[PDB]
């Protein structure tokens, strides 16, 4: 049955995982670069604590950014329902996959089936884009979706990825904050596989148990503390099995990551996930001795401090030739902190900027919108600096040199603040470069159709002009004659003009005064 308002289907447990994956990938769904499965009890009891709401909103944002798939119970009860709402909001503000897995036998309303439409225990949620029902056996609605979900995740973990950069494998990360028994079973069966993933010491109580644990008596007493009524209700043998499962889970801790309750940063979620994957990439021993791939993975996810702590330090002796490949990627990835780290870790920027590198970068990374705007400005308004910049960019697009100035210009025209500052901190003519950047930004904003982009460019130009003024004040205070010599210093083909001419042509009254 297909319902739209998305795709729904009824499957049998005997169905092979490969066939399902081929079906999903062929026509409707794009290749996954990452997967998140949310482990939460299907009970209708759910608390929308502000912390949990924020955490799950950040998780959805991260999934949207990466393009990752999301697996969930999808029965419209408690947490799952909230998740649906969030994804709806996200699409109202690309596309995000929100696959849900449920049991056909545990569905109140059945509408067998161009596309049948049904509007209405555990009735499935309508916010999820795709939904899969599996009740080939146990028509009384016992738990059967968990086995199929585990099989599909196992198959995915075995699949190779061409451009994943995680060693050719998909990160599978089981995000779990559920207090249910099935949550514990799912966590155990996932950890039995090479699936690193996360728990939060928050509302989830069994998650709190696991976090606190990270002897049989101690685990038993912790469980009783966090599950007084639940532990009282359960029988002896099933609860002994519970303790066995929990001990087996706690056996391995490298795959197990936890979120501290004290932490209140906005980027905590990402960190956790990142760290999890990192450990599984390193402790897996498949590429533990590998050095490059670790750095590539830490560059993908915005984790700078961890990379400095782990990748670098004296023992490795990385050398210079290895850092060029990651610097080039960081330039495109827009990771200014990593750019600064690489520059201050021994990379020679001057040698890095080769003619072929700059040519390829300008050709296949200059925004088409920005290129059209620059062409229009050069053809219509024109200026002493616009002609020079246009000639340089056209030369690099078709096929001293001052490569640093070219890189600074490339960063500026794309409106990258931190990267532009990082590059500026390397140039020789800092004050002149800042004045030229301010003038160029002003001219571009004078011929920019975008409304808010004009304000952003104006703010950036103001920042750069203030920077130049402060630098020159310090320089002049240090010495009176050398500062004036710098003032009159004629540009060596920056724009053919010195600081005074650029300032007067840019109407920079503050600098002149």
């Amino acid at each position: 049955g297909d319902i739209q308002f998305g795709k729904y289907l009824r499957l049998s447990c005997d169905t092979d995982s490969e066939t399902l994956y081929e079906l999903l990938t062929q026509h409707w769904h794009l290749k996954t670069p990452n997967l998140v499965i949310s482990v939460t009890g299907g009970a209708k009891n759910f608390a929308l604590k502000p912390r949990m709401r924020k955490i799950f909103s950040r998780l959805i944002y991260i999934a949207q950014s990466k393009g990752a798939w999301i697996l969930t119970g999808g029965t419209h009860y408690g947490l799952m329902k909230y998740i649906g709402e969030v994804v709806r909001d996200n699409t109202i503000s690309e596309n995000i996959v929100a696959i849900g897995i449920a049991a056909w036998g545990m569905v109140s309303n059945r509408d067998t089936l161009f596309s049948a439409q049904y509007i209405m225990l555990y009735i499935l949620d309508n916010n999820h884009t795709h939904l899969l029902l599996v009740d080939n056996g146990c028509h009384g609605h016992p738990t059967v979706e968990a086995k199929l979900r585990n099989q599909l995740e196992k198959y995915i973990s075995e699949r190779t990825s061409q451009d994943s950069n995680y060693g050719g494998k998909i990160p599978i990360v089981c995000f779990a904050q559920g207090g249910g028994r099935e949550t514990l079973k799912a966590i155990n069966t996932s950890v039995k596989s090479k699936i690193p993933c996360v728990v939060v010491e928050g509302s989830g109580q069994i998650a709190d148990v696991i976090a606190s644990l990270v002897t049989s008596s101690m685990v038993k007493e912790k469980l009783v503390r966090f599950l007084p009524r639940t532990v009282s209700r359960l029988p002896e043998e099933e609860i002994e099995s519970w303790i066995k499962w929990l001990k087996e889970i706690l056996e391995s801790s490298h795959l197990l990551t936890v979120i501290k309750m004290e932490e209140a940063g906005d980027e905590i979620v990402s960190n956790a996930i990142s760290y999890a994957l990192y450990k599984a990439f390193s402790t897996n021993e498949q590429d533990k001795d590998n050095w490059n791939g670790q750095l590539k993975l830490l560059l993908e996810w915005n984790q700078l401090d961890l990379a400095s702590d782990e990748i670098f330090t004296n023992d490795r002796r990385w050398e210079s030739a290895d850092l060029q490949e990651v610097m080039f990627t960081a330039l495109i990835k827009d990771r200014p902190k990593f750019v600064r780290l690489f520059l201050e870790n021994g990379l020679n920027l001057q040698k890095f900027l080769t003619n072929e590198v700059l040519t390829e970068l300008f050709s296949t990374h200059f925004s088409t919108l920005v290129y059209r705007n620059l062409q229009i400005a050069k053809n219509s308004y024109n200026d002493a600096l616009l002609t020079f910049v246009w000639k340089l960019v056209a030369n690099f697009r078709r096929s001293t040199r001052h490569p640093l100035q070219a890189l600074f210009i490339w960063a500026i025209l794309q409106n990258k603040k931190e990267l532009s500052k990082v590059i500026w901190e390397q140039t020789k003519g800092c004050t002149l470069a800042a004045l030229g950047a301010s003038k160029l930004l002003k001219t571009l904003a004078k011929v920019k159709n975008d409304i808010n982009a004009a304000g952003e460019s104006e703010e950036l130009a103001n920042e750069y002009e203030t920077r130049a003024v402060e630098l020159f004040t310090e320089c002049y205070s240090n010495d009176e004659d050398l500062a004036e010599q710098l003032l009159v210093y004629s540009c060596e083909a920056w724009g053919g003009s010195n600081c005074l001419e650029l300032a007067v042509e840019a109407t920079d009254q503050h600098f002149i005064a």
Binding site: L9, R10, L11, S12, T15, T19, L23, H27
Partner: peptide, 11 residues
């Protein structure tokens, strides 16, 4: 087409 493949796979 797609429905035919779906029902063939699901028997």
């Amino acid at each position: 087409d797609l429905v035919n493949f779906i029902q063939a796979n699901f028997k």
